[PDB]
């Protein structure tokens, strides 16, 4: 043991100052809007462009598109013309005998510009925690179908994080398929998911479209550029910093029911240039592993409590909400949740690690893990070695530059630290 004044107490991680961080997901998350059809009784796979047109025909408020929030560093007319080109090419498809399996677009000046044919610090914005909260929530629809792993599946089947998995596996598989099939062509790819309502009816959902650029993906690190065009009811003026990488169009009038009654709200199109590597597309196609990762964490956790009682607690926890875990916080203090909330929070964490995969995240994870073990040992009054805390903090803080997900994880780690070493 050493004198108290010489003992090193882990300090809060220092998060960067700067302009607020911006969205960098490959698709919209909480801001997404689905145009949906209730599928036939048979629930037979339609072809994507047929389903996409049929979904767009469920919306009756389409209007002439206009730019409402320009991309600071882009040629905004090119984004506006790209969307008009998508609608013109969909009309071309409608005019033909049959809907085609695939649509290779005209390589216009606007698509060549948009398909190419960050070390500045940013501060943590509120929108990242707001996204994570929404990912933890239950939706009205089921995203998967059902060894007592059915407890877990029951708690996550309707979870929004599960929608993100199904949306990500669909679009990355479709983009890999197009990338192999049509390497030189600008292919129009509907962004689709399938779910089931409370009433057991299957639904097909259209989020928007991506346009694939040139895709000669010889190596895992080779990049395919794409343009994403995504429906939303989110007014870009609420959080402009979130949308720094986007051009936002107003494309329609949506009738919605509210308190005053039925009201018109704008439908927007969030448009950006983006890219992905072959390896990143392959990891996108593996997002179901998020369900297995979070399931394993829940199991490992239930074993601990079952290893205490010398009895399997699986049945008790899921069936009896009485047992709780700390998973949230407010101005008041730490909030505890039933095992179901823990399932959804761990799933959402695993899903967000996939949606926001980065080298900064890999560095943050490996290094923060070492610091977490030191903090746990300090909580337990075990006198861990601290000689390398200087090195550890340098390594962690080099990862805290501008990445929204890494910054939120640092802020979360800090909240944990204030409670852990109270």
């Amino acid at each position: 043991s050493i004198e108290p004044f010489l003992r090193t107490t882990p300090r809060p991680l220092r998060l960067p100052d700067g302009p607020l961080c911006h969205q960098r997901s490959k698709f919209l998350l909480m801001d997404a809007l689905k145009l949906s059809i209730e599928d036939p009784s048979h629930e037979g796979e339609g072809i994507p462009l047929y389903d996409a047109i049929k979904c767009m025909k469920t919306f009756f408020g389409w209007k002439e598109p206009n730019i409402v929030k320009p991309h600071e560093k882009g040629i905004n007319p090119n984004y506006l013309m790209a969307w008009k080109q998508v609608l013109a090419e969909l009309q071309d498809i409608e005019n033909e005998e049959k809907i085609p399996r695939t649509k290779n677009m005209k390589r216009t000046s606007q698509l060549k510009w948009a398909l190419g044919e960050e070390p500045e610090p940013r501060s943590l914005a509120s929108w990242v925690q707001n996204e994570f909260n929404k990912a933890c929530e239950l939706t009205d629809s089921s995203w998967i179908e059902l060894m007592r792993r059915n407890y877990f599946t029951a708690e996550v089947s309707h979870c929004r994080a599960t929608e993100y998995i199904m949306k990500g596996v669909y679009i990355n598989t479709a983009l890999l398929n197009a990338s192999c099939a049509a390497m030189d062509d600008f292919q129009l790819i509907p962004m689709i998911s399938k779910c089931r309502t409370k009433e057991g009816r299957r639904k097909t959902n259209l989020y928007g479209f991506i346009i694939k650029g040139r895709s000669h993906l010889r190596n895992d690190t080779d990049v395919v550029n794409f343009v994403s065009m995504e429906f939303s009811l989110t007014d870009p003026r609420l959080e402009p910093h979130k949308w720094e990488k986007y051009c936002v169009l107003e494309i329609g009038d949506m009738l919605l029911r509210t308190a005053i009654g039925q009201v018109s709200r704008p439908m927007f199109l969030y448009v950006r240039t983006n890219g992905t590597s072959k390896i990143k597309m392959k990891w996108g196609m593996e997002m179901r592993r998020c369900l297995l990762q979070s399931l394993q964490q829940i199991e490992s956790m239930i074993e601990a409590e079952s290893s205490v009682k010398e009895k399997d607690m699986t049945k008790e926890f899921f069936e009896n909400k009485s047992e709780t875990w700390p998973i949230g916080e407010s101005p008041r203090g730490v909030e505890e949740g039933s095992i179901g909330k823990v399932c959804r929070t761990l799933l959402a964490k695993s899903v967000f690690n996939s949606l926001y995969a980065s080298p900064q995240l890999e560095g943050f994870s490996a290094e923060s893990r070492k610091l977490l073990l030191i903090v746990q040992a300090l909580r337990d009054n075990l006198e861990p070695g601290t000689f390398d805390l200087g090195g550890l903090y340098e390594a962690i803080e080099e990862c805290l530059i501008n990445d929204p997900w890494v910054l939120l994880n640092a802020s979360w780690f800090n909240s944990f630290l204030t409670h852990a070493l109270k």
Binding site: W325, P326, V334, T345, L372, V375, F416
Partner: peptide, 10 residues
């Protein structure tokens, strides 16, 4: 606000 690090408190 959900924060999965708070699980480590238990």
């Amino acid at each position: 606000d959900y924060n999965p690090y708070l699980l480590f408190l238990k």
